[PDB]
Amino acid sequence: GITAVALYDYQAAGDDEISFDPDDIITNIEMIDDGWWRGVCKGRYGLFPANYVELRQ
C-alpha cells in the first residue's frame, strides 16, 4: 500500500510510538495527527515521527 522512509535515527519516547532508522523503510503509513503519522513495521503498528520521517509515494 503506502511506504515511508525516515531521514535520520529517532527513538520513540511514547507508549504507542515505534522507532526506525533511515536504512529501515516501513509500510502502511498514514496521517492521523496533523503533526504525527502512523507506521507499520512488518505487522508492528505504532506512531511515525512526522518530523523524523516522510511518506513515500
Binding site: 519516547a13 511514547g14 492521523i32 504525527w36 512526522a50 518530523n51 523524523y52
Partner: peptide
C-alpha cells in the same frame, strides 16, 4: 570545503492533542 552539515531538525518530541 564545499560540504556542510544539515540544519537542525524541528521538535519531534511533540505529541498530538487528541487521538
Amino acid at each position: 570545503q564545499r560540504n556542510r552539515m544539515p540544519p537542525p531538525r524541528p521538535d519531534v518530541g511533540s505529541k498530538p492533542d487528541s487521538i
